Amino acid sequence: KCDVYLWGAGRHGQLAEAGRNVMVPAAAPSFSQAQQVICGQNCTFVIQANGTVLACGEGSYGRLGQGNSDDLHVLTVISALQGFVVTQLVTSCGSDGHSMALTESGEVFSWGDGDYGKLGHGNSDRQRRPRQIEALQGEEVVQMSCGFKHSAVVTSDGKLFTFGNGDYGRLGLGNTSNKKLPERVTALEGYQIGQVACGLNHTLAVSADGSMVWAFGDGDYGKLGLGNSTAKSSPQKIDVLCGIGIKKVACGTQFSVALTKDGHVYTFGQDRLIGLPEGRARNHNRPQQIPVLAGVIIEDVAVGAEHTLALASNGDVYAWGSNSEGQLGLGHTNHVREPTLVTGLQGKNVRQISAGRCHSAAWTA
Ligand SMILES: [Cl-]
Ligand SMILES: [Cl-]
Ligand SMILES: [Cl-]
Ligand SMILES: [Mg+2]
């Protein structure tokens, strides 16, 4: 067992017994068998240590993978993945919602809203239960991301595939067509891609050795980190992030986050969401280190739609950004510009975090 804390919006039952509108982290005893918790678009998934997946919250457009679209207020097993050991799960933080789960054998199952081909089945049909993406048969997928209207997967041999809505270049294929089947990002074929993150309408990718980062998609608010606000349909190196050793990247609606291996956080994009003091908004269109976290070793970051959580090596959790539903966990619903300590998690020995559209989670597994 572990301890799980949930907070933010809970009106569709996505926080189960923790409540309906929660401004401070609240214990969720029913989640105690979680090894992972994944917060999405008004929904929450759990992966148990044995590979079983459960879901609760908003069920619109098959979100919960139950074979129907019912809202659920208690964690409920996704029977359609029974038989498979699920190791990872990702879900979108906006639009009409979709999800991808990864098995032990490197196979990817997708479900939810089918618009734009983002599920990868060669059509745009809703899938109310998890369905294997057959086109990835024989690929060993190791990492995945769900954007608002597109998706992406990374393979063990370092290839990157994208699919879904093509508007503004977000698939990185050099045009803006929608793709209903996974497409190799040929521009990156000469490199080994280790991870991908997808936002409202841009995408970031990191090389396997952490030495290189690329951006593509819509350019608003300088969220591509290339020093302007122009959309790019092919991957473009983010020079500031190359050579510094990147552990992880993540994307929100109008901003990007990068974590270095030595525990520093860089942000870029819309000023209100990037956690910097106001003077530093000058260069919001290039990556900048977050000053208030300089004396903190950050082990992980989790990005929702418009908020960010950061976990320090001592277990402390920091939050900043939008907060109208209490998703920061700070006891109010006011916007917070810079990373702020979540005091409700002090002494809780948090080891993992997750951020959804407008709810959050932290737990001790
Ligand atoms: Cl399996
Ligand atoms: Cl290929
Ligand atoms: Cl490096
Ligand atoms: Mg634009």
From Swiss-Prot:
Tissue: Widely expressed.
Leader peptide range in chain numbering: none
RCC1 repeat copies, ranges: 1-49, 51-104, 106-156, 158-208, 210-261, 263-313, 315-365
Cellular compartment(s): Membrane; Cytoplasm, Cytosol; Golgi apparatus
The organism's place on the tree of life at top rank: Eukaryota
Disease: Macrocephaly, dysmorphic facies, and psychomotor retardation: An autosomal recessive syndrome characterized by large head and somatic overgrowth, intellectual disability, and facial dysmorphism. Seizures, hypotonia and ataxic gait are observed in some patients.
Subunit architecture: Interacts with TSC2; interaction is inhibited by TSC1. Interacts with PKM, ARF1 and ARF6. Forms a ternary complex with clathrin heavy chain (CLTC) and HSPA1A.
Described function: Involved in membrane trafficking via some guanine nucleotide exchange factor (GEF) activity and its ability to bind clathrin. Acts as a GEF for Arf and Rab, by exchanging bound GDP for free GTP. Binds phosphatidylinositol 4,5-bisphosphate, which is required for GEF activity. May also act as a E3 ubiquitin-protein ligase which accepts ubiquitin from an E2 ubiquitin-conjugating enzyme in the form of a thioester and then directly transfers the ubiquitin to targeted substrates.
Descriptive protein name: Probable E3 ubiquitin-protein ligase HERC1
Organism this protein belongs to: Homo sapiens
From-to range in the entire protein, with total length: 3996 to 4360 of 4861
